[PDB]
Structure formats: C-alpha cells, structure tokens
Design a protein around this nucleic acid. Sequence first.
RNA 1: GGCAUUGCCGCGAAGCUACCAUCCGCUGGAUUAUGGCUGAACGCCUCUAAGUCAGAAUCCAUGCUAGAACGCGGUGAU
RNA 2: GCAGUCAAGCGGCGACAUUGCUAUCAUACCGAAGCAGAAUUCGGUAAGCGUCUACUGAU
RNA 3: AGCGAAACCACAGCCAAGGGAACGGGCUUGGCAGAAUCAGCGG
RNA 4: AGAACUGGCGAUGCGGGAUGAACCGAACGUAGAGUUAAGGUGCCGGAAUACACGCUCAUCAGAACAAAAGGUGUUAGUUCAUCUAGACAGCCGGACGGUGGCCAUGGAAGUCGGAAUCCGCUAAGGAGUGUGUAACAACUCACCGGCCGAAUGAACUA
Lengths: 333, 50, 421, 68
Amino acid sequence: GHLGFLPRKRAASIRARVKAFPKDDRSKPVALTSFLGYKAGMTTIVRDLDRPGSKFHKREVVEAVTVVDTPPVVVVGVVGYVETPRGLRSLTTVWAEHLSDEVKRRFYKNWYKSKKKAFTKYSAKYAQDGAGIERELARIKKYASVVRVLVHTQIRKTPLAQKKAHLAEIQLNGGSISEKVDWAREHFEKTVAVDSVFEQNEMIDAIAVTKGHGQRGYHSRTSINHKIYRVGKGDDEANGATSFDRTKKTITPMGGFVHYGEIKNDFIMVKGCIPGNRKRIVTLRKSLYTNTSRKALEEVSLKWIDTASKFGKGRFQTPAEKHAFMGTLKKDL
Amino acid sequence: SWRRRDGVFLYFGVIANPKGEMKGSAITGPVGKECADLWPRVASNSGVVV
Amino acid sequence: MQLSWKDIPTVAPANDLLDIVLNRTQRKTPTVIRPGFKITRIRAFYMRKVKYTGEGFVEKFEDILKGFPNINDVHPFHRDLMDTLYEKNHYKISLAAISRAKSLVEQVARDYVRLLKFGQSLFQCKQLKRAALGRMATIVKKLRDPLAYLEQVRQHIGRLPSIDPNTRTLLICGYPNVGKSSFLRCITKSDVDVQPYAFTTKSLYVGHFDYKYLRFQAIDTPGILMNNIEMQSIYAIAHLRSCVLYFMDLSEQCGFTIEAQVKLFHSIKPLFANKSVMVVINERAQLLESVKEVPGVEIMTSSCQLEENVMEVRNKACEKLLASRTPFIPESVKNLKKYDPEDPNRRKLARDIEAENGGAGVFNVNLKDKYLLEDDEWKNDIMPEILDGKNVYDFLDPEIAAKLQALEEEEEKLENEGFYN
Amino acid sequence: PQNDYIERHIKQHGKRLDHEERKRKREARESHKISERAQKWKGKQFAKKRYAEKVSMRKKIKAHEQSK
RNA sequence: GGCAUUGCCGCGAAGCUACCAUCCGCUGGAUUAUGGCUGAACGCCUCUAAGUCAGAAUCCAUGCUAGAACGCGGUGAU
RNA sequence: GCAGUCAAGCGGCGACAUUGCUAUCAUACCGAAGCAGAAUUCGGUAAGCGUCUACUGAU
RNA sequence: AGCGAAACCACAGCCAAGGGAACGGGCUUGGCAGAAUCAGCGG
RNA sequence: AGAACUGGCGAUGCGGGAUGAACCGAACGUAGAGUUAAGGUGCCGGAAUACACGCUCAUCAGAACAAAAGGUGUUAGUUCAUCUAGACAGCCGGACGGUGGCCAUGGAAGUCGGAAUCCGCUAAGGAGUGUGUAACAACUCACCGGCCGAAUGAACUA
C-alpha cells in the first residue's frame, strides 16, 4: 500500500510531537497556535445541512463525532528560539517558580521514593527581585525571533488515574516578539480557556498516536479538516442540549463512557472520527493553512447527540427519560 | 441494508432505453429512493414508491 | 449513412500513412533482440512484427474505405449530384483500386507469415521482413493520385448542405445575377449578394424556414445558361421533390434581355412543368405572357427591394405545396404586468439577485420572511421538537392552557382520594 | 454546413489583426528552427529528408538552367 | 438440569470488525516542449547567442512518517 | 531482387531520386487539418499516476 | 526442570564496475555502516 | 576446416597500462652508491597546476562502428565571378507599348487548365517568381536608376 508509514515500527513516545507551525502574524496580537486534550470517545450527531447547493440541502445528516477532553491549558514557561544555519535552536528557557505537582511528578518515575527536592536552586533564585531573572528575558528578546510557550494538561481535573502531566511546547505567531515574551510572562501560572483558542466551525486538524493492533498501528498520524462542531464547558450545564432539541442533559453517555470516566469538564466535538482511542492524549492544530471553501464557511446546526448507554443495547438517552417510560421496579418504591 | 441521511437503515434484473423508460405502463414493486428519485421517468411509471 | 457526411476520417497520403504505420510498428513492437536468445522467441518476435504491420495497414485501409459513402447506392438524386461534383466513374475506380490494394496487402502479409513460420536463419527472417515492408510501401506509394483525389473529395463533401429529398424544399432557378440571390437571403439566413457580376452564387445554397408551424427550406440555383454548374444544378432540380421557380429582369440585371430570358426559360419545358412552377419578374408584355402556355404558372412584376412580394410568393408556394366552461382565475395574478426582462424596473427574479450577490448555485437557500406569518417581530425559530423523550410537535397547539387547566386539578383529586391506600 | 462557410467567414472578417505578421515571423524562424533541429533515430529521418530536399532543389535548378 | 476437554431454541455488550460501518486525504517556486519582448550575428531578418514574461501532471520547495541507535541544543537535581 | 534517364567520386564500378506484379492506448501547457461547434487524427512532451550480502516486526 | 547428539567445517564473508572459459570470495577503483542479539516474505 | 613460415607463452620473474596470458621495456646471486625504458608528473601517486601556437563549451565533449549526410555552429584555405565605371546589405524609384500574346469555359486581363514564349525600346524588364482577382487591380521576384563607401557573392577542402 503506502510506503510513507513504513517500517511498521512503534513510535518513540505516546505524546504526538508537533513539527510544523504557522509562520507569523503582522498585526494580530499574541494567539495560541495549537491546543491539546484527551480523547473521551465517540458518539453520533444529527443536524440540518445548510451547505449551499447540496443534494440534501436542509435535510437531516448523521455522522460520527468524537468528543475530546480539553481541560483549561496552563502556561508554566516560555522557550526562546534563534534562527541558525542548522535550524531553530533553544538558546534559553525559563520557568514560573510555581510548577504544579502534576508537572514536578513528570520529572520523576519513583516520586514516592524521590526526595522531591527539584526546582529549588532556580526557584529560590527566581524568588529574588527579578534582576537576575530579567537577564534571560532580555537576552531572548534581543536575539530570538520565534518563541514557544511550555504548557501542560490539568490532569487533576480529568478523571484519568494519572497524576503526572506532560510538557508540550506551543509556538506563537504574533509579531514584535517582545510583545510575545511580555504576554507569556504576564500569563505565567495562568490558564487559557478553550473558547479562546478555537471557535465553532474552525477547520482545525489533530495529530495523535493510533491504537496498536496487538505492531500494526501505534504510529503518529495526521489528518486535516477535523472541523469542530460545538465547544462545551463542564461548568455550563446543558452542554448536551443542542441548539434545536435543547434537551436538558449532558454529552456523557448513560452509565459513563466505555472504559473511561464521566465527562464533567470542558470538551469539544469534532466532525468524524479521530486517531487514538479513549485514555489517550491528543493534539489540535489549525492545519497551518486556511481551507477556503464553502464546506468550511457553513455553520453548525446540531440537533441531537447519541448519549445512550454503551453497555449492551440502549433504550433511553438520559435517566430522566428511563424512569418515566420504565416506571418503578423492584429496587424502587 | 444501506445507510440513509435521515438516520435509519433501509432494505427490502430490469433494463431500460437511454431515456430510462421501461417496457411497461403499470410497473409496481419496491421502488425505493434509489429509483423513485434517481429515475424520475420510472417513478411516474411506477406506483408503489418505497 | 444518411444524406449528410461529416465524419469521414481524414485521408492520409501514402507517404503520411506509410510513415504513421512505420512509427506504430517500430514503437509498439519490441526492438531489442540478440542471436543468443531462444530461436523460437526470435521467430515469434519477427512474426509478431510482420503481423502487426500488416494488420495496421489493413485496418487503416478499411477505415479509409468505410468512411467514404457509396455513391451508387446512396440515392439517385445524390448519385447524380455527385456525378457532376466528382467523376463518378473515377470515384468507383479509385474505390475498387483501394480495395484491391488492401486485399493484396492482406495476401502478402498472410503469405509472409506462412513462410516466416518455417525460417531457418535470423538473417533470412530479417530479409523476408525487409522484403515484405518494401512491398507494402511500394504498393501504398503508388496510391498517391487516388489518395489525393480521395482527400480532396472528403474535404469538399465534409460541408455540403445536403438534405433529404422527401423534405419540403423550394427550388429557385434563373440566369446568374438575375436578382434571385437576395431572394434566398430574405427568405432564409444566407450570405449572398446581388453584386453586378454573373455568378454571385457558385454553390447550391440551402436554407430552412418555417410557415404555418411547418418546416420548409429553399435552394438557390447557382445559374443556368454543356456547363458543369448548369448540369449539376439540373441534376438536382429534376430529382428533388420541390417546386421550381423562375426569375427575370428587364434590362439591368442578368445582362440578357427579356426575349433571351424567355427563350432560356422555354428550354426547361420538358421537365419543369411537373413541379407547380411559379415566376417572379424583377411588346414586352407579349413575351412575358408567353409563359402562360405552361399548364399552370403565376407571373408578377416585382423588385429586389419588394420584400412583401417575396413573402406573398413564399406564402402562395407553401399553400400550393400543402394543397398537393368558463375558467376561474385569481385576477390579482393576471392584473400584474407580465414579466419584461428588458425593463430595468421589472420584478427581478431570484436568479438575477443571486447572480448579483450569491453568484452561481454556490449561494445558500434562506426562508427569512418567506412564511406568511402575522407578526414580523419574531420571524426566527428554533423549534424544540423533542422534550423528555417526546415530540414537541405532538403538543404544539393553540392555547393548550385551556386543556391543561382541566387536568391540573386531577393531581389534587388523586392525592386526597388516596389511590396509594 | 454551407459550401464555403469558412471561406465566407474569411472573406467577411479576414484574418486575425496580426495573422500576417505572425505568419511572416514564423516563416522567418524556419531557417533557425531547421538548423536547431538538425543538431538536436529521428536524426536519421531529419538528415534523409534534408538531403532529399537538397537533391531535388539542385536537380530542379540544374535542369531549368539549360534555358540560359 | 448435577453433563456436551466446546450443548441446543431464544439473546448478548465487549475483544474482533468491514460502506459488511464512519471521517479524512497540500500550496509556492525553478524548468522540458511551446507562445512573445527587446537584439544582433550577416548594417536586413529572427525567439537566443546576452536577459526576460507566460508556461509541464517534470524537479524542488509545503506537509506526513522514522530520526545519525557516536548529528546537536535548552532546562530541574549533586 | 530483375533492367534502367539514373552519376559526388572514379579503374569499367558507383549511397541520392523515380518507371512494371508481388520509444504512452488515455492523463496535455502547444501547433496543423476544409477544426462553423462537440468529436476527431496527426508532429508535441513526459514511464508522473492511469491501463553469505536483504529485513519484512525487534533488542 | 535436567540430560544431551548428528550432518558439515582449508578460512569464510556489506555491496556496484573491470576481471577474457567470466568463479569473484580474499586483485583494483568507489560507495557502506555498530560489541552483542530475537525473528523470517512463502526465497 | 585443411595447412606452409617466423617470434612469446609453454618452463618466465620484475617495472607500467589503477583491474587482467595474448601489450611495451626487461629475463633474475644478497647488497651500498647514481642514470634510464615502458609508464608518468593536480590529488589517491613518488614527479613541473613547465614554456609557445591556436583549436572545442558537448542538453553526460575530451582524456570496436552506423561514418553516407545535416548545422544561418566554429577555427583556416582552393576554385568561379562582381570590384573604387563605386563590394553586399539597407532604403527610395523604374519595373513599360502591341497585350485582354493563341483555345473552351459564365470567367482565366501572367499566376484554375494545353503549348509557343513573338517583340519595340531603354539604364531596365518574363506574354511574368509569388502574395493576390468571382473576373480586374495593387505589391513584388531577376532585371535596372539615386544615397552609401571596398572588398565582396557562390561551391568545396582541413
């Protein structure tokens, strides 16, 4: 078949490395190039086709939709890069002096046996009155032309049985790299909302390690046009309540997800399937380009999401509907 | 069966001229959307749509 | 084929066809062999090369032959017409010669294949192939004249305005530059003039026109004064199922005087009388009245600028050929003026608006304000259509509060009654 | 359709606004094109054609030279 | 229903899994042949010898895959 | 092949023309055809996609 | 868990070209690439 | 295949042709000192990126066969003519009379077809070399007049 994914050798790391990024923005302010999350699972979506000239215009359309868990990303550092004949080089790096336990644990494999005496000499130095620390920022600003921001997932919010986080370097495209570094510093230890990185109808793309069929699979993959249908928030009740049906419920299937915890945090719905599987980290990017076409220009018209249980068959969408139709039982009044 | 855009499955040799007209005036049978809509000429010559 | 020919394959000159066949056999067939290869493989190589060359030549000859129509068997009218455009005997002789050459090529190829099947030396096979190719080229090369004639005939016949003899046709005859040249142009779309020289119309122009919702067409005679053009025109006037018309001029056009025109007209007596003849004219009265000796004719004076006379004559010819409860309407709809595309103030269709703004079908359908709803303040809808596992469409009715009131008290009735004992 | 359709079009509208100039330039480039092709199995055919043309032209010139 | 190294009638998620089910599958240059400009050589002419515009599905750039297991850089720990 | 007007050289021969049967099939920037238009073939370009050594999974 | 052979073995292997009967595997010109080490396309 | 003759291998080192039986020099005790042959002198390779003449830009130059031709590619010569009576090209102009030279055609006045090409005159001209005409006409090709200032035009040969 295709020799571009051969040899059939397992990837080096579960986390999918991001290679390319957009170039620059001359006028717009600092913006995040990409976002990351975890694959919650897959469900079904039904809407009305507003795509112009469609044979099924204004007719119902059903397609599988993946749910990605995207807890608020938090910034913990900034990395400066300088152009060289050998390519980009990270000449300097800096932290925020308040690394969360989720990040400190990633620096160990025996955290239980570890003395946990990390980020002390630098943190104590960082605790000084700036003077020493500002030298690195000034050096980065003087020479660096591309700046990357270190981020990690708030695994504590997710239901995964994992405390260690992962560090991902995210690039920025805003001009006047001095503005970029100033913005990065002002956001140290702060979180960025999901809605502030991506919006509805965006033709973003995602990359993740596919499921291992076992050495088939388990490799890094990419696919463009992973359109986001609707971004949801865990605190904003009625996320599963679509625009049309507006049924009071949540996207979490009855009885939770198959071999995965219940979704109770920020999440995004993406058209079609996505690489990887449940309990796997994924990354999101804007495809590095703009897919100018009427397919992108259309708008979402979500009508209903399949939230039935996946254990056995399913006759109900929410517990409120089951009790009314099924009535009482032995285990009830 | 085959998948329909409405969200539900559906399931239950003849040839025609270049215009799609069949050799009959009282055609009947399971004339689904694959023929009732694809072949408008046949749909008029067929009574039992779907 | 029908009475029209425009799909005849181009006749490749012997040199061109020979070069094309040589290129085809050289490229498609293999070209690498050595004496150390299997002898049977080399025999098969040579046989395949020879057979491919022969088959290509034969197929090209057959395709060239099949494209040309059979003059003899097409139609007596078209046969006679082509007999004057081209030498019919030469045409048949050339076709027979091409067929004989193709048969000879087939025989040579078969004989060489049979002989080549039992070759004894590689150089012997090479010499046999060389001889076969040389003979094929020599036979093809001698067809230069017939091939050139066939190419010329194909070029000339690829645009003729031939029509079925049975179709209603009008034939116009007369001296060159009589004035009838403008007749065809006025009756039907054509590019002809009344320029003051004799043969302003060399070809047999044909043009279609309609009258009384019935199709018609007219044919202009190039000129009649044996002459090749005159013979060709006669061999189509006589055989066509049409009405023959004559034209005359007094002293300016056609050069010849009225007496000479009448004398020429009387020369077509043996065969013209059977097609409902009519005459239009662009001591002299007696000569003009002499046309009345025909069993039936009509003569009227006119001019090239007398368009109404031409229309009346056409209508008369068409007539002669042919001879041979109360509804209910929403008056409001019809009161509005009918669509006027040329009017800038017309009720522009959705097509024009979309083209101006939405362009082609790439535009999206919208129903804003389309519904005949009373209040425009809420011309936007997000229908629930589903609630608590039940369709909202089964509950959306006007002021259902009246019905719900009668059921409200049932909760209290059940509670105090005590169905739960 | 008509016996002189393309002829009628040519006589009514002539040719392109620069057809004569383009044709003259193309013919002028023939000398350069022939020389370029002569130096660029097709070579055998090109050489044979050029030699045949040269021989024919020389024979025609020599035979007609007897008039003077 | 105490047994069919693995039971039958009626069902069954999951592992498996395919339009037998689903989503997706790139945007800029340099050039071959070719169509021109200027301009000679050969005082002319011309597309080319100096340069240049348009132009190949070709080549390279864009992206994806793995990453020299002795190619490299930055950071928390002593 | 047979005989020849055949003739640059040239010791009596002789490439040249004429007289007798017997590295693309489509994918095309480009030009020609008597190509009104579609269609068409031709010279055009490209093989792009159509029609005991070695590791295929590994330490 | 423990016992425990045999066939075969001048020595044996990273490749392209030349090498005359072509045998290239130990001659020449160039390019490769890891001590140690599972497992094989239907070679 | 048969077979007359002379040299090497046979039994033959070593130097060189980077690579080898058919090649060139050279045939042989172990050694110290200097000069050669083939073969070499930019590097792997020990030796001058020496001197002078020009030749060639190959879209794979250059370091036993298709070899007859093509190039308006290049470097130099032989032959025949023009040539200061004004070289070629570049321009302007002449480019005519019998004439629509003889024959049919619808027509053909030079250029759709058949064959002669008569002939006055001039510096110069075909009853016409082509574009071109339905049939004319116009430009013009070889042939000539004016400007220009010298060597040029054509075929072959290395």
